[PDB]
Design a protein around this ligand. Structure first.
Ligand SMILES: [Ca+2]
Length: 752
């Protein structure tokens, strides 16, 4: 033997689940049957003709990278069906033979050094195809000749001989070279793969461009929030590669590898809700039918389990606890149902281990300043907030994917409750893309893909417990500007809008919500205590409503209440919508099968060419119509100010006051006074203590923010960067936000 052989086998069991696999296992069996089925389902449809012009009729075209790549995965699947224990084709030599015949057939007929490393979608040629090829090599290593195994590895080394790209792509190169390095037994290349992990976009935090940030954000393609998309890939490949090298003379040494641990705690954990990976951080992938939020979540949790296999003691146990809690929480789609068999074996061992307790659920407010996102996690629900600015683009759409993502990150609110399927079950191809909840837009008209013109997008976090966010809106595709804010407290979220003006000559609207209902569309809902009709295809105007209650798709834990402080007039419609995935993802491999889902859509009509229009509403998750009614009578909320210059809301019961100052002029909101653009939040414990948090959301102030609180103090403690200059009669201090990059500064004052 030798290490190279031991590694190859470790990678084989990572793909197979090794000899240990227990087919008797209910979930392992299911995965196995499905494999064997799909596999031969192909095999018994291949063109085994000695003189074939293609291998699969539906995948003909040795020149279309998309099809070629697809035939390699096809093979890959057959290679696994012939290797995974419990498979209906385990051992079948003829299967193996056919696989190899097909391989060389493509060496001369398509994939070889005859092509350029530039051909459209170099990705397929340099990464995609060689990733499947390596795995086949590894699985069929034995059944392969010396020369045959050369036409394979030589061509791969051609397309991708070195590592030197960005994040996701760099990691793919790394595992592409690493894996082929162990099978070709080459220490130089293999050591190059280990070192690639230290490159930009991976281990080291990035202060610009692609990669992971210290605040836990993840960027790809320079301006897109992508933790759930490309981020997801970087996590998987890195975990897989680090696991292989782990324990060998090529093990990862770089001290930065520790950052990988934080990715889990800060970058992913807060963005997972009972199995789902929030769509707002998945980029254009939301348009992929095979990658909806829960499927994606499973892939991530799968990587957590992988990590737990070699991570240091403190972290590994933590990884097991988290994986266990997620696997148990997801009652929508079984985790074991869409992950590798080896992953099933490993997770099963964590879940049934009575010594491993599920980790507590996250309860917090996190401001991902570097990617314009924000999250609130509470016991019964979670809120995802997607914004954009001069730093982050509205949405991404390339290769004919996500053609309707216009408003996906333009002040969009995503509510997660017991209805775990809300954003799954073909939501994306059926939801009216022009009415994304939380947004303000010109009716039925889109916006362009790109970064905005305003720097003011971000928010403040009060000790990761509460927070407030804001977005200075100004579309480029058409005239419309507005000031939008959100204040997250304990059980409610207040959304405020002001300065809504436009000359576009198109009716402007703010969509309060657009929820997918049950299969019947009969969800009960009330307004001001009156039961409303539940029929499909009906559109009604609710005038002068103070509160609305919509019942969830689950018996408990998914109802949603809406309160309108000054009362309002809502435009609503409950309809059945039909659409296909091909409409938002025009690729050959995407399903054209039409699907129908039901929706209850509600919006505020601002009229045509409005000037200085405003709006205010509060989301009350998981409350009964009676609780919503009670709230609407004696509310815990009190709007302090909702102007073009400052938006502020107070939570009477918690003693919280949040405020977003939109201009560089002196303004005061309740007890708060600011001289510069800022996001501020305070908590007051009568005659005892006053807390304050401040941030410069613009990330452009290279001076300070002068704050003054209307209270008398006798002592204080503050984060560095804060200088207190007066404690009495009133509190005064400045915040050095030079290069703060959107972070929040905290200070606590003692009263008496
Ligand atoms: Ca409250």
């Amino acid at each position: 033997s030798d290490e190279f052989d031991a590694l190859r086998i470790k990678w084989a069991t990572l793909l197979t689940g090794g000899p240990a696999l227990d087919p008797a296992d209910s979930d392992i069996a299911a995965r196995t049957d499905k494999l064997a089925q799909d596999a031969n389902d192909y095999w018994e449809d291949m063109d085994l003709s000695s003189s074939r012009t293609y291998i699969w009729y539906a995948l003909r075209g040795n020149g279309t990278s998309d099809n070629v790549n697809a035939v390699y995965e096809r093979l890959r699947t057959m290679a696994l069906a012939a290797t995974t224990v419990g498979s209906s084709l385990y051992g079948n030599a003829d299967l193996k033979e056919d696989i190899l015949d097909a391989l060389d057939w493509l060496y001369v007929n398509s994939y070889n050094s005859t092509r350029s490393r530039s051909a459209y979608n170099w990705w397929h040629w340099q990464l995609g195809i060689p990733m499947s090829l390596n795995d086949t090599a590894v699985l069929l290593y034995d059944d392969i000749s010396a020369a045959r195994m050369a036409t394979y590895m030589d061509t791969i080394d051609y397309f991708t001989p070195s590592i030197g790209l960005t994040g996701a792509n760099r990691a793919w190169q790394a595992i592409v070279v690493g894996v082929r390095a162990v099978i070709v037994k080459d220490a130089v290349k293999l050591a190059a793969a280990r070192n690639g992990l230290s490159g930009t976009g991976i281990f080291p935090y990035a202060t610009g461009g692609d990669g992971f940030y210290a605040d836990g954000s993840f960027v790809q393609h320079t301006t897109f929030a992508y933790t759930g998309g490309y981020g997801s890939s970087v996590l998987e490949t890195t975990a897989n590669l680090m696991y292989l090298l782990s324990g060998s003379t090529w093990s990862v040494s770089d001290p930065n590898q520790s950052n990988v641990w934080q990715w889990i705690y800060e970058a992913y954990r807060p963005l997972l809700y009972k199995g789902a990976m929030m769509d707002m951080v998945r980029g254009r992938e939301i348009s992929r039918s095979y990658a909806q939020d829960h499927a994606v979540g499973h892939g991530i949790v799968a990587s957590i389990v992988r990590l737990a296999q070699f991570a240091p003691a403190p972290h590994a146990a933590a990884f097991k606890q988290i994986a266990k809690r997620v696997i148990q929480e997801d009652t929508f789609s079984s985790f074991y149902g869409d992950v590798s068999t080896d992953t099933i074996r490993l997770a099963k061992a964590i879940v049934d281990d009575p010594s491993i307790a599920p980790a507590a659920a996250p309860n917090l407010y996190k401001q991902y300043a570097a990617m314009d996102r924000a999250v609130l996690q509470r016991p019964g629900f979670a809120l995802g907030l997607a914004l954009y600015s001069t730093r982050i683009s509205s949405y991404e759409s390339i290769n004919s994917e996500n053609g309707r993502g216009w408003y996906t990150g333009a002040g969009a609110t995503y509510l997660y409750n017991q209805d775990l399927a809300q954003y799954s079950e073909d939501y994306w191809p059926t939801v009216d893309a022009y009415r994304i909840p939380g947004t303000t837009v010109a009716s039925g008209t889109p916006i362009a893909s790109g970064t905005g013109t305003s720097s003011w997008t971000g928010g403040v976090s009060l000790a990761g417990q509460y927070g407030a966010s804001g977005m200075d809106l100004s579309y480029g595709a058409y005239n419309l500007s507005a000031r939008k804010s959100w204040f997250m407290f304990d059980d409610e979220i207040v959304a405020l809008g002001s300065g809504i003006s436009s000359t576009a000559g198109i009716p402007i609207e703010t969509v309060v919500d657009n929820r997918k209902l049950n299969g019947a569309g009969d969800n009960a809902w009330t307004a001001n205590g009156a039961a409303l009709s539940t029929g499909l295809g009906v559109a009604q105007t609710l005038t002068g409503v103070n509160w609305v209650h919509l019942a969830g798709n689950t018996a408990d834990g998914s109802d949603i209440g809406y309160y309108f402080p000054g009362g309002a007039t809502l435009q609503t419609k409950r309809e059945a919508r039909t659409g296909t995935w091909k409409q938002i993802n025009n690729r050959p491999a995407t399903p054209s099968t039409a699907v129908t889902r039901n929706y209850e859509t509600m919006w505020i009509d601002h009229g045509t060419n409005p000037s200085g229009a405003s709006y205010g509403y509060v989301l009350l998750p998981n409350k009964t119509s009676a609780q919503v009614g009670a709230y609407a009578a004696d509310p815990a909320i009190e709007i302090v100010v909702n102007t073009s210059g400052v938006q502020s809301v107070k939570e009477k019961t918690l003693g919280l006051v949040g405020a977003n100052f939109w201009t560089d002029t002196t303004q005061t909101a309740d007890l708060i006074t600011s001289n510069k653009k800022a996001s501020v939040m305070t908590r007051e414990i009568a005659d005892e203590r006053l807390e304050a948090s401040v941030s410069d959301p613009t990330q452009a102030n290279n001076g300070t923010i002068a704050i003054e609180l209307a209270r008398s103090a006798e002592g204080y403690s503050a984060d560095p960067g804060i200088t207190v200059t007066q404690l009495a009669p009133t509190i005064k201090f400045t915040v050095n936000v030079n290069g703060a990059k959107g972070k929040s500064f905290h200070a606590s004052f003692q009263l008496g």
